[PDB]
Design a protein around this nucleic acid. Structure first.
Ligand code: MG
Ligand code: MG
Ligand code: MG
Ligand code: MG
Ligand code: MG
Ligand code: MG
Ligand code: MG
Ligand code: MG
Ligand code: MG
Ligand code: MG
Ligand code: ZN
Ligand code: ZN
Lengths: 190, 77, 49, 169, 117, 55, 143, 292
RNA sequence: ACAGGUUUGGUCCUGGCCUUUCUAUUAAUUCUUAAUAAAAUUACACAUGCAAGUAUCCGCGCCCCGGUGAGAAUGCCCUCCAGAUCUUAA
């Protein structure tokens, strides 16, 4: 591809109109299979390194066709103009590595307004809009909240009495541990 | 796990559990908070039991249930 | 005092029914008395009345 | 299907479109009709068409028919309390009997609507589980959260092997 | 299945994916397995934060209070999440763990100050 | 549950009576039940070891 | 692009059942019926051949069924009523395609509460979703 | 007694000014298709079908509620200093209950600093979308709503789709909702694309925005050029009702002019392109009087 | 099933088989890394390690988890629940 910057230029160029014309890129492509019904799984990847795996895909046979979310005329050939659904790989004839990328490009183009799709009429989320309820409005703060005190007074670290400390140390002999007073208020950083 | 009819292992047949180190100044201040929290959760459980009783009575003999119980028989007659 | 979220729930419950009473709600601890672990328990069978 | 006189009355759509739902008190419906005379034409058409419609939506209610026992066609509903509702039909058409039955003993529009609205509550959109009961299996598929490891590989800083290896040194 | 006893417990069933835990808050029997038969699912917990740096937690408070009034017990992480939410008071285990973390930070600062000079 | 081809098991019912009789006749007396070896801190009846804080 | 009405024809020993299809169901028929429709002009069609599969009888029965079609205009002429099309996507919009040219009869048609139609079990299964055949939902090539 | 968008005196006029165009209302979308149905009907039955279709299109043309910008949520329920750095991320708690509305759900957040506050709107709506998803909503902000993609979608004259997507995505009382609505209302009357909103369910909304922004020149000339005299004499009445204190509303009362002169008086009193409006009215007169 | 091959000098009809699609186990050939899911011959017999501990003694649980499908056409769904467990005065 000489363009490498504008995939839509090739679709309007002359060398495309004389080859494909008004017919989609997968018009004359026919996929071979084993019996009367083709497999539900198409070729995984048709280009391994530099070797082409025999009969190439309609997209992969001409390297000037770039899969991109900008050139919508190429992606429109893979979406039914009536049902608005994505053509599957057995329907198109492309390899799965390109079919997944085409699905991603179609979604990216629909997420950019470039490709049209159905937009249903949806009613609003809430039947009534009430901003007066206590869920979204401000609540009257607690007297312990406006004073700067914890929600429960026993949340703070209180020093136990020395008699209780001795009563605990008398019963927990042998397993005694180093004492530790109130922890710091603010934890320093590294 | 094991079963009631399985004998214990030889490595733990003569094994006794060992308690860890105990810090009293922390253990007491933790047990007091334990009690202050357990009384609060007990009160909250009692509040929830009262709410459940209220809802069960509203569902059994409620002023909304009796209206239907009467109007259905009236319309039936 | 009630916990913060439950306090907000209670303040928003009666507010919808037209109750402008800004009185502080408290949780009662009358029946919340519990015995310590050193309190010995009974060993007889409970009578289902 | 093809076999039978009216193959349409043996389809799921025909049996589902019949909106005749009794109350919880009706238990037995004894329909006694005749096979002669121009009068019992409505009762015969009712037995031929609307009996499966009612039986499909009332599976617990017994429906028993009788032919050539009394010269007057009638229906007899046996309620749970023991009250016997007798409905005589002599010249009523097919739809008239259905409307009369729905008027005398049936579920109202509001009665059906409240029940079908309460049944919707059991399936909750916020829960998680299999596709049979919940809309999502693993929370990875949520657009905002972290994707599933089988679909998107997790970075090395989040792998449990890297955390178990950095702690060894 | 039929059990000999057990008590209703509101716990967290760890049903998720490898290196991606996912706890479903559920009230179930105590003698049933973790991801086994349950009574009612109430909420969900996501341990790993999303792109917004938020750990999503779900609580069906109306059913939670109903089951607790019915006599369901709670577990340690359930109590921790309830204390973080504010439906229940903060757990003393969380308090003492915060205190231990502050003491560890203080010891780290002291060691960094004594190793610098 | 309740079938027509249910066999009336009698051994399962007789074992209940046997074990009920053996529970009362061979009931270990509280003396040797609470007997205690002050050397190994092991109960000779059940085989449990006492905790370390009670030593 | 499609045929007017569903045609269920029975030739000598070949039973052909062809159903009308929208713009999105293009020529999902036998490999010979598709070849014939591609030269006729039909772009969307579904057809099922049961019984015999003889090529000559298949062609003759297909042509007979396609020739015995009833145009909307002829139906409106023979019934003196408006042929109102109700597109499922266009909602309750009463689209009119054919008008009964001539004497417009003001007598309403007899509304039958139960249409005595001759359905087929092969269609009842498709309507109820009982078609568990693995060859039914296979992805095939394009037209 | 400030007239609101939900008032009958405004709604009955907006419906008449929008009008009923079934050929655009019941338009085949780009979804799955099914074979059509056919049935023989009389002329009376055809009229009944058309009136039922009108009754159904009323629901299609049901207007979306337009509100003001909601106040940001900033309220602290409790403060815990012991949670200064115990956690790295913040915990978002959402109350799940099918029997309560969404406007009354408690969406709280415990920050890692130790505070427990209420969540803002952008977080509350996101959590409501996560725990109760509806078709047409994206958890994250879609990229199409940026200036580039939005300008491209405007150039592709998809404003109706833009509005139907924004209404489904955002709340009608949020900030970005009003932002995008005013942005597309700027472009439609900048480029003169009022016809794209002729029979949609947003014509009332754009008219109610234009009567508040006092930009009626383009919409008025576009309504006059389409031979719509009733839709203009109804718009001038909406303007007079919404702005009672004004020379345009007082001169009309003191003159007692008819609906046809209500446009000329509005073009003379408070119109910017009054000469253009007068020229368009004269061109409409010299054509309609001669042709009918 | 959108079907195709196959009888006969040849045609039509009836008709069975196979091919065409999708999943799982084994065997042959080949083979480079990660992640995810799953590891499935055996109710044939087992060497060895671990899987039930807690606690100031009391007590509590000790096929609960987990494992398997030999027997049972066993069963699916629906009323009633004795009895057992948690909190209460109920
Ligand atoms: Mg064993
Ligand atoms: Mg796993
Ligand atoms: Mg054959
Ligand atoms: Mg032969
Ligand atoms: Mg192998
Ligand atoms: Mg080998
Ligand atoms: Mg023990
Ligand atoms: Mg098992
Ligand atoms: Mg047997
Ligand atoms: Mg019981
Ligand atoms: Zn390829
Ligand atoms: Zn996952």
């Amino acid at each position: 591809s000489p363009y490498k910057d504008e995939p839509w230029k090739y679709l309007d160029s002359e060398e495309y109109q004389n080859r494909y014309g008004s017919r989609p890129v997968w018009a004359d492509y026919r996929r071979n299979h084993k019996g009367g019904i083709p497999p539900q799984r198409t070729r995984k990847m048709c280009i391994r390194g530099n070797k082409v795996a025999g009969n190439p895909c309609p997209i992969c046979r001409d390297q000037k066709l770039h899969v991109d979310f900008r050139n919508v005329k190429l992606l429109e050939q893979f979406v039914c103009a009536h049902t608005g659904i994505i053509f599957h790989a057995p329907y198109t004839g492309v390899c799965m590595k390109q079919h997944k990328k085409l699905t991603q490009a179609i979604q990216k183009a629909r997420d950019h307004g470039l490709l049209r799709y159905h937009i249903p009429q949806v009613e609003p989320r809430d039947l009534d809009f009430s901003t007066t309820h206590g869920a979204v409005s401000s609540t009257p703060p607690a007297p312990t909240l406006v004073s700067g005190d914890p929600w429960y007074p026993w949340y703070s670290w209180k020093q136990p009495p020395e008699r209780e400390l001795s009563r605990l140390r008398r019963l927990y002999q042998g397993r005694l541990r180093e004492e530790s007073g109130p922890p710091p208020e603010l934890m320093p950083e590294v | 796990r094991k079963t009631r009819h399985d004998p214990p292992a030889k490595s733990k047949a003569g094994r006794v559990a060992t308690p860890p180190a105990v810090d009293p100044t922390e253990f007491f201040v933790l047990t007091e908070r334990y009690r202050q929290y357990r009384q609060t959760v007990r009160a909250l459980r009692l509040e929830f039991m009262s709410e459940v009783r209220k809802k069960l009575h509203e569902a059994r003999a409620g002023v909304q249930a009796e209206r239907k119980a009467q109007e259905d028989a009236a319309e039936h007659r | 005092p009630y916990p913060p979220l439950l306090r907000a729930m209670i303040l928003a419950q009666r507010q919808k029914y037209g109750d402008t009473s800004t009185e502080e709600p408290m949780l009662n601890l009358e029946r919340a008395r519990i015995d310590p672990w050193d309190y010995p328990a009974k060993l007889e069978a409970k009578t289902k009345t | 299907p093809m076999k039978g006189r009216f193959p349409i009355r043996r389809t799921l759509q025909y049996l589902g479109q019949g909106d005749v739902v009794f109350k919880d008190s009706v238990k037995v419906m004894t329909v006694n009709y005749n096979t002669h005379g121009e009068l019992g034409e409505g009762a015969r058409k009712f037995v031929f068409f609307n009996i499966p419609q009612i039986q499909y939506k009332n599976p617990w209610v017994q429906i028993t028919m009788f032919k050539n026992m009394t010269p007057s066609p009638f229906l007899r509903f046996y309620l749970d309390s023991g009250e016997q509702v007798l409905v005589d039909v002599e010249s009523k058409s097919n739809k008239e009997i259905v409307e009369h039955i729905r008027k005398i003993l049936g579920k109202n529009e509001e009665t059906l609507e409240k029940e079908e609205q309460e049944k919707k509550q059991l399936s909750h959109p916020a829960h998680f589980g299999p596709r049979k009961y919940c809309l999502r299996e693993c929370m990875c598929e949520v657009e905002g959260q972290v994707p599933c490891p089988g679909l998107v590989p997790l970075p090395k800083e989040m792998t449990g092997k890297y955390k178990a290896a950095l702690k060894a040194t | 299945r039929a059990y000999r006893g057990g008590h209703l417990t509101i716990r967290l069933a760890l049903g998720g994916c490898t290196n991606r835990p996912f706890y479903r808050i559920v009230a179930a029997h105590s003698k049933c397995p973790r991801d086994g038969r349950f009574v009612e699912q109430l909420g969900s917990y996501d341990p790993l934060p999303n792109s917004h740096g938020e750990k999503l937690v779900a609580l069906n408070f109306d059913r939670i209070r109903h089951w607790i009034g019915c006599g369901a017990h709670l577990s340690k992480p359930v109590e921790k999440l309830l204390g973080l939410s504010g439906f229940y008071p903060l757990h003393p285990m969380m308090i003492t763990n915060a205190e231990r973390l502050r003491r560890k930070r203080a010891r780290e600062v002291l060691l960094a100050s004594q190793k610098t000079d | 549950m309740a079938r027509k081809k249910v066999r009336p098991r009698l051994i399962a019912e007789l074992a209940r009576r046997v074990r009920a009789l053996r529970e009362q006749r061979e009931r270990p007396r509280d003396s040797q039940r609470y007997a205690l070896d002050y050397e190994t801190m092991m109960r000779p009846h059940s085989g449990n070891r006492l905790p370390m804080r009670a030593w | 692009h499609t045929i007017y009405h569903d045609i269920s024809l029975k030739f000598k020993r070949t039973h052909i059942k062809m159903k009308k299809q929208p713009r999105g169901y293009g020529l999902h028929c036998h490999r010979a019926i598709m070849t014939i429709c591609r030269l006729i002009g039909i772009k969307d069609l579904y057809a099922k051949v049961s019984g015999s599969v003889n090529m000559l009888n298949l062609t003759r029965g297909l042509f007979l069924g396609l020739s015995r079609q009833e145009t909307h205009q002829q139906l409106a002429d023979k019934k003196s009523l408006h042929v109102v099309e109700f597109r499922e996507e266009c909602g309750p919009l009463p689209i009119v395609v054919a008008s009964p040219q001539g004497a417009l009869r003001k007598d309403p048609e007899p509304e039958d509460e139960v249409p005595d139609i001759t359905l087929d079990w092969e269609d009842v299964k498709a309507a109820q979703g009982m078609k568990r055949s693995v060859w039914s939902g296979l992805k095939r090539a394009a037209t | 007694r400030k007239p609101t968008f939900m008032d009958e005196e405004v709604q009955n006029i907006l419906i008449k000014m929008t009008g009923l165009d079934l050929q655009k209302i019941f338009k085949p979308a780009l979804q799955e298709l099914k074979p059509p149905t056919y049935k023989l009907m009389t002329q009376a039955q055809l009229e009944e079908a058309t009136k039922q279709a009108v009754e159904a299109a009323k629901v299609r043309l049901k207007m979306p509620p337009v509100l003001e910008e909601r106040a940001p949520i900033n309220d602290v329920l409790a403060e815990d200093k012991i949670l200064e750095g115990t956690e790295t991320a913040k915990y978002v708690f959402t109350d799940i209950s099918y029997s309560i509305p969404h406007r009354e759900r408690f969406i709280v957040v415990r920050e890692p600093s130790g505070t427990l506050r209420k969540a803002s709107w952008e977080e509350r709506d996101r959590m409501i979308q996560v725990y109760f998803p509806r078709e047409g909503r994206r958890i994250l902000t879609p990229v199409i709503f940026k200036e580039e993609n939005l300008q491209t979608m405007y150039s592709q004259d998809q404003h109706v789709d833009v509005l139907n997507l924004c209404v489904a995505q955002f709340e009608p009382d949020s900030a970005e909702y009003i932002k995008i609505h005013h942005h597309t209302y700027e472009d439609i009357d900048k480029c003169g694309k009022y016809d794209l909103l002729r029979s949609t369910r947003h014509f009332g909304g754009m008219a109610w925005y234009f009567v508040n922004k006092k930009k009626i020149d383009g919409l008025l000339i576009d309504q006059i050029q389409r031979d719509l005299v009733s839709d203009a004499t109804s718009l001038v009445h909406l303007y007079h009702i919404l702005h009672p204190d004004g020379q345009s509303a007082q001169e009309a009362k003191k003159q007692g002019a008819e609906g046809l002169h209500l446009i000329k008086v509005f073009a003379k009193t408070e119109a910017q392109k009054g000469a253009y409006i007068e020229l368009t009215l004269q061109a409409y007169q010299e054509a309609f009087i001669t042709h009918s």
